[PDB]
RNA sequence: UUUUUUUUUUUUUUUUUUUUUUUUUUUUUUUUUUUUUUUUUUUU
């Protein structure tokens, strides 16, 4: 009853890869990305402080504070949330891709791994492995790795009134490799603007069902 | 809530024709059907869904009244990708096939005695739970069963438009409409019937919109009673 | 896998009184009726199937299906919900009152036991023990005991657009002692109409939120 | 946990916040300063939660280097413990101190001392709706709880903030009731609700014209984002 | 359908208690894809 008055994800990734490089494969991760949603829900229902969900055949200790009451429980730099997984695991896939040149293996990834959030906006692997994987949440942790895309997708989304600005706040504090938010907002402006044009010219069309159906339903007042 | 998650494949197409599966079904079963059997089913459908999501077996054989049948189970979490041939049965597909079977019965004759029996016997909890009864029409009453989006023509678009009205009122999550929107109107693609049969649909909607949408109906004696005290 | 095709509160009361006559007193009950609300809330947050809430110093096993998902879990004729307590417990108070003639004890009840729903409509013990206690939910289970008041309050409420009719449905199926809904709707019409006049002439303004305030808030688009 | 207790029935007592405020300033003016208070306002909710564990009737918490005798009935069992119009709860402190800060600001027109105050003292709730000192002192501090004790002094803002909050469905209307029974200096609610209606609607318009974000965003971020056509 | 269940109504008090609570490479709240497939709301 008496009163007075630093998380690095690059580090967290090395930690995470170490403990799990062993147990990972495409089919496991694929299944994670599909149910990233489903678990956010369930964990909000569970009152517990931790949980060990299983994706396919890869169980993992994640911290739960999706439950209403836990939302403010502090978290160590090696701890996992679904968000942090989504980020780390996205980065993993990219690393799997750049590992090699194999068109056969590259095609396996584009076949196995699938990103609903991206596909829901008509964006596919053909657009770019970076830009594709940037739609997964948690990629704001690795702006240099993902070429500002996780940011600029957000920017572009906010510009079209499809996202509440307050969801950018996560990304705007994050580093660019070894630069503070305050520094790179100043230095990397053109680079960011390049990375936005790149985002702008994607097809933001397909994904929202067929076009016929899009419109049909609009006729009877819906979205 | 036991936080086990699984794959969800693509395996595109499958070309499932419900009219095809329906005939195969009537052939194999017409023999063993009757209002008592079916009546029961429609009341224990959701019951049977829940119970199959415990039983880990791939196939099951439930029994309604005195009618047993081979259904495919993948209500159970792990089984949700088990592939299904266009003659096989899920609860869903039965609910659709049987809903149509009942319609055929009604339309078979104009016997006021047999229609009597049908209204009286068979019952759609979902319809009644929106304050809707047989008197609104047969086609519209049975369209409230799930599975009837397999036969959009046969039920005069009502399965689609019920869904649309449901969304328009924020009574339903739009994900659940998507089922219908990929279905056919007898011999058309969605792409086609969405383009052409728009007027026909808006009619079907108007009909659905003019139903006594109550949620939890009342008894008829209660209204005439309350109407004594100036309530209506 | 194989399929085919009624709760009597008079009985449920005897069961309930038996198991709890022992542990009850005014100060306990009083506290229940105050937090009847607060528990409806909390139980909706708890995912569990049962709960043992404590009112003052009287703990009790009640069935929870205030949680969204449990709402359809079937319930035995001896089981308690808050609603069924509220009813039973209301009946208990009346029985306490008619037990005796003691003006001293009668005054202890009017002092100890308090009904917000009644007082919020300006209705107090002076109106009648029956009519007062009829504002408590769950009294529809005992229409004969509470002289059609639980019903007619509802009727009168609906007449003044202060209640959605659909809340009367509970009461309209309930018995009058040993008569079906279908029978007494026919036979007891005058009696009901007497019990409604009785209701009509109470004071519906006082006790609640002051009329000045009612309006004030309306001016800034509020009720 | 579901452990329900009884409820107070006694009425009116007399708690005159202007009275209790002077007694308080008298007893404590001595020991107060921006550092102490600054701290309080940041650990107020912290202290609430901690007192609802400590079963004692009274407590003596300390902020910065300022200790004080508060009355605890955050603890479940204690919620009916009766309180004299000179005693302190966290709530009443929040109100008293919010007023103390205002007196400080108004004491002079020293741009140097106002500087210090804006810089030091900080209302998490105001900042967490995207509101800062620049919106005005009276309006900024009204976001503290307890300031409904002094509706005049804070230009109705404590009431109208609450109203706007409900109008937006950001708040449960039960929590407005506190204010609606309070005074406007020398009037009953009954009176000031009747008469000072225009004055209130003004105070509302002011509150409604605040930059109601929710969660701040650094000033550099806005000017940055304004390069890409975002505000 | 229901002698079921659930969702509105929960008193006065210049009283008391209960939601809001900034900086942060923290945390939480949006976006979650194709098939006349399958699963997941609707159930008198």
mmCIF file with all atom_site columns, N, CA, C and O in Angstrom, chain C residues 141-148 175-178:
data_model
loop_
_atom_site.group_PDB
_atom_site.id
_atom_site.type_symbol
_atom_site.label_atom_id
_atom_site.label_alt_id
_atom_site.label_comp_id
_atom_site.label_asym_id
_atom_site.label_entity_id
_atom_site.label_seq_id
_atom_site.pdbx_PDB_ins_code
_atom_site.Cartn_x
_atom_site.Cartn_y
_atom_site.Cartn_z
_atom_site.occupancy
_atom_site.B_iso_or_equiv
_atom_site.pdbx_formal_charge
_atom_site.auth_seq_id
_atom_site.auth_comp_id
_atom_site.auth_asym_id
_atom_site.auth_atom_id
_atom_site.pdbx_PDB_model_num
ATOM 1  N N  . UNK C 1 141 ? -45.769 -18.538 -10.318 1.00 0.00 ? 141 UNK C N  1
ATOM 2  C CA . UNK C 1 141 ? -45.917 -19.954 -9.964  1.00 0.00 ? 141 UNK C CA 1
ATOM 3  C C  . UNK C 1 141 ? -47.037 -20.173 -8.944  1.00 0.00 ? 141 UNK C C  1
ATOM 4  O O  . UNK C 1 141 ? -47.527 -21.294 -8.796  1.00 0.00 ? 141 UNK C O  1
ATOM 5  N N  . UNK C 1 142 ? -47.436 -19.111 -8.246  1.00 0.00 ? 142 UNK C N  1
ATOM 6  C CA . UNK C 1 142 ? -48.416 -19.236 -7.189  1.00 0.00 ? 142 UNK C CA 1
ATOM 7  C C  . UNK C 1 142 ? -49.533 -18.199 -7.326  1.00 0.00 ? 142 UNK C C  1
ATOM 8  O O  . UNK C 1 142 ? -49.703 -17.325 -6.476  1.00 0.00 ? 142 UNK C O  1
ATOM 9  N N  . UNK C 1 143 ? -50.310 -18.324 -8.400  1.00 0.00 ? 143 UNK C N  1
ATOM 10 C CA . UNK C 1 143 ? -51.365 -17.356 -8.717  1.00 0.00 ? 143 UNK C CA 1
ATOM 11 C C  . UNK C 1 143 ? -52.489 -17.381 -7.703  1.00 0.00 ? 143 UNK C C  1
ATOM 12 O O  . UNK C 1 143 ? -53.003 -16.339 -7.330  1.00 0.00 ? 143 UNK C O  1
ATOM 13 N N  . UNK C 1 144 ? -52.873 -18.564 -7.249  1.00 0.00 ? 144 UNK C N  1
ATOM 14 C CA . UNK C 1 144 ? -53.912 -18.638 -6.240  1.00 0.00 ? 144 UNK C CA 1
ATOM 15 C C  . UNK C 1 144 ? -53.401 -18.017 -4.954  1.00 0.00 ? 144 UNK C C  1
ATOM 16 O O  . UNK C 1 144 ? -54.099 -17.223 -4.337  1.00 0.00 ? 144 UNK C O  1
ATOM 17 N N  . UNK C 1 145 ? -52.178 -18.366 -4.563  1.00 0.00 ? 145 UNK C N  1
ATOM 18 C CA . UNK C 1 145 ? -51.594 -17.844 -3.328  1.00 0.00 ? 145 UNK C CA 1
ATOM 19 C C  . UNK C 1 145 ? -51.502 -16.331 -3.373  1.00 0.00 ? 145 UNK C C  1
ATOM 20 O O  . UNK C 1 145 ? -51.828 -15.670 -2.385  1.00 0.00 ? 145 UNK C O  1
ATOM 21 N N  . UNK C 1 146 ? -51.078 -15.788 -4.516  1.00 0.00 ? 146 UNK C N  1
ATOM 22 C CA . UNK C 1 146 ? -50.930 -14.338 -4.680  1.00 0.00 ? 146 UNK C CA 1
ATOM 23 C C  . UNK C 1 146 ? -52.074 -13.686 -5.451  1.00 0.00 ? 146 UNK C C  1
ATOM 24 O O  . UNK C 1 146 ? -51.862 -12.703 -6.155  1.00 0.00 ? 146 UNK C O  1
ATOM 25 N N  . UNK C 1 147 ? -53.275 -14.241 -5.330  1.00 0.00 ? 147 UNK C N  1
ATOM 26 C CA . UNK C 1 147 ? -54.512 -13.567 -5.759  1.00 0.00 ? 147 UNK C CA 1
ATOM 27 C C  . UNK C 1 147 ? -54.453 -12.916 -7.153  1.00 0.00 ? 147 UNK C C  1
ATOM 28 O O  . UNK C 1 147 ? -54.868 -11.773 -7.333  1.00 0.00 ? 147 UNK C O  1
ATOM 29 N N  . UNK C 1 148 ? -53.930 -13.656 -8.126  1.00 0.00 ? 148 UNK C N  1
ATOM 30 C CA . UNK C 1 148 ? -53.784 -13.194 -9.513  1.00 0.00 ? 148 UNK C CA 1
ATOM 31 C C  . UNK C 1 148 ? -52.945 -11.941 -9.695  1.00 0.00 ? 148 UNK C C  1
ATOM 32 O O  . UNK C 1 148 ? -52.837 -11.427 -10.805 1.00 0.00 ? 148 UNK C O  1
ATOM 33 N N  . UNK C 1 175 ? -51.035 -22.410 -13.416 1.00 0.00 ? 175 UNK C N  1
ATOM 34 C CA . UNK C 1 175 ? -52.340 -22.835 -12.899 1.00 0.00 ? 175 UNK C CA 1
ATOM 35 C C  . UNK C 1 175 ? -52.934 -21.844 -11.909 1.00 0.00 ? 175 UNK C C  1
ATOM 36 O O  . UNK C 1 175 ? -52.236 -20.959 -11.416 1.00 0.00 ? 175 UNK C O  1
ATOM 37 N N  . UNK C 1 176 ? -54.222 -21.999 -11.617 1.00 0.00 ? 176 UNK C N  1
ATOM 38 C CA . UNK C 1 176 ? -54.810 -21.351 -10.453 1.00 0.00 ? 176 UNK C CA 1
ATOM 39 C C  . UNK C 1 176 ? -55.208 -22.434 -9.470  1.00 0.00 ? 176 UNK C C  1
ATOM 40 O O  . UNK C 1 176 ? -56.320 -22.967 -9.532  1.00 0.00 ? 176 UNK C O  1
ATOM 41 N N  . UNK C 1 177 ? -54.288 -22.758 -8.565  1.00 0.00 ? 177 UNK C N  1
ATOM 42 C CA . UNK C 1 177 ? -54.470 -23.881 -7.658  1.00 0.00 ? 177 UNK C CA 1
ATOM 43 C C  . UNK C 1 177 ? -54.507 -25.184 -8.441  1.00 0.00 ? 177 UNK C C  1
ATOM 44 O O  . UNK C 1 177 ? -53.460 -25.754 -8.764  1.00 0.00 ? 177 UNK C O  1
ATOM 45 N N  . UNK C 1 178 ? -55.718 -25.629 -8.777  1.00 0.00 ? 178 UNK C N  1
ATOM 46 C CA . UNK C 1 178 ? -55.928 -26.919 -9.437  1.00 0.00 ? 178 UNK C CA 1
ATOM 47 C C  . UNK C 1 178 ? -56.676 -26.820 -10.776 1.00 0.00 ? 178 UNK C C  1
ATOM 48 O O  . UNK C 1 178 ? -57.401 -27.742 -11.150 1.00 0.00 ? 178 UNK C O  1
#
